[PDB]
Design a protein around this ligand. Sequence first.
Ligand SMILES: Cc1cccc(CN(C)[C@H]2CCCC[C@@H]2N(CC(=O)O)Cc2cccc(C)n2)n1
Ligand SMILES: [Fe+3]
Ligand SMILES: [Mg+2]
Length: 498
Amino acid sequence: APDEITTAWPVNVGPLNPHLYTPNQMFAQSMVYEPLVKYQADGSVIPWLAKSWTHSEDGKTWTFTLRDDVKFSNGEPFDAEAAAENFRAVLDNRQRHAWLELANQIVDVKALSKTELQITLKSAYYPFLQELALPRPFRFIAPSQFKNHETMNGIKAPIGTGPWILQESKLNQYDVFVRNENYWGEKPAIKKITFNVIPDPTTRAVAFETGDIDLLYGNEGLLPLDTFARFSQNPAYHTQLSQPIETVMLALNTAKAPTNELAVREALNYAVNKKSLIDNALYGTQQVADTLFAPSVPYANLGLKPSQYDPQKAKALLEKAGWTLPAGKDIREKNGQPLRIELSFIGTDALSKSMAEIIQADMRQIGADVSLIGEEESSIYARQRDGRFGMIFHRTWGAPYDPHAFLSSMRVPSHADFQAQQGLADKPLIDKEIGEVLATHDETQRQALYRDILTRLHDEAVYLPISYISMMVVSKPELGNIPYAPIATEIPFEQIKP
Ligand SMILES: Cc1cccc(CN(C)[C@H]2CCCC[C@@H]2N(CC(=O)O)Cc2cccc(C)n2)n1
Ligand SMILES: [Fe+3]
Ligand SMILES: [Mg+2]
């Protein structure tokens, strides 16, 4: 059946609560649940569940006119009351969404009629529409599936308005979705999608080679990159590599010795040949990153000066900061303390380990001793929240989060970016300007604030940008060309057309 496909994912999709995070998988929430406005690749949003909208002079009161023909997959109507109830359910858990500034901005949501939905904001929050378009949390489950009129304590059935319906889930085995035959929009050509739960990238590759699965879709960890290169040459297969979607980097802890020293952070940024790293560990499949955000990211084309690979300059910077080589040793010392930096990473991630070994070797060449701390996933996430790291692998979030939402989250102390920035003397200024950039409606001032925030982060060498990574696809040829979604975390199954 050419209208039924089998793919894979490292874990189950989760319960598909539209308003919660782990272990819900974002792409799967986006398959079932829909936004008021839909994000487009050009950076705009289009009408979706909302046909149209107006806003007040002061930018704080927004009124959406909703479609009147939309049903949840269980036949119950989608109207302004159902939408308002969803906003209430989300904001009843407001603390958990405070990383996303819109969750702190919404004062009230009212259904003025079946088709009129009014949303009032604290301030004139410019990324309002783009954050409504995110996969979560502002998407809509049928209110009949709330538990005690809430969603934060669980849901009943995951009933959305979207083009896919979860048929069944089997923990550690599979998830099955089917086409919504009563979808308000266009019918997908695919009728059934089976997700096999396959946690290991080599095992995913083997599953494709045997014919067990029709499609692999993911980022640079989807499968071994040496295997992907071979697949791309195989005339029996189809492969794709998108244009870059987000940045992979190291975050350097400005609050912990010795990365608290600007000279040390600058020297680290001169010591890595990123092209060689990409050609070594990533088999040349990704692009070199000189800045936190690629120049193609909105508001980020600033002409920031790259720190090109220059081990001679890296050594000179350390020497001038007092980090010199003792007799017969390769690791520098200052006041008898060795230049030692801990790099923690997920120890079972072979790609992360490979890049870690490359970074360790590169930094030894300029006299810095990198200790590799490979730990389980839970421990690494705890380290990121607590700032218990010297260096960590880190990534941006792709459109439409980059740059406004990623920057906004830098103010939240329980995440890696704040922790890495905590030792900066101008961190209060940076957090102040991040608050201003989200609220100001002077577009000249908005661009000037983005420039200042990103220039400070660049000049202070908080990050060591490594690569701009791409989405990758491996598929049976009969599926045809596989499209990409405007939102980097979504998979546009409804656009596959065999
Ligand atoms: C905690 C954490 C930190 C860093 C990265 C991640 C991984 N998540 C999935 C990223 C993936 C890419 C898009 C953004 C997305 N989330 C939003 C979301 O999960 O909906 C960022 C975020 C920020 C703050 C809190 C939470 C829970 N999440 N999780
Ligand atoms: Fe997240
Ligand atoms: Mg560079």
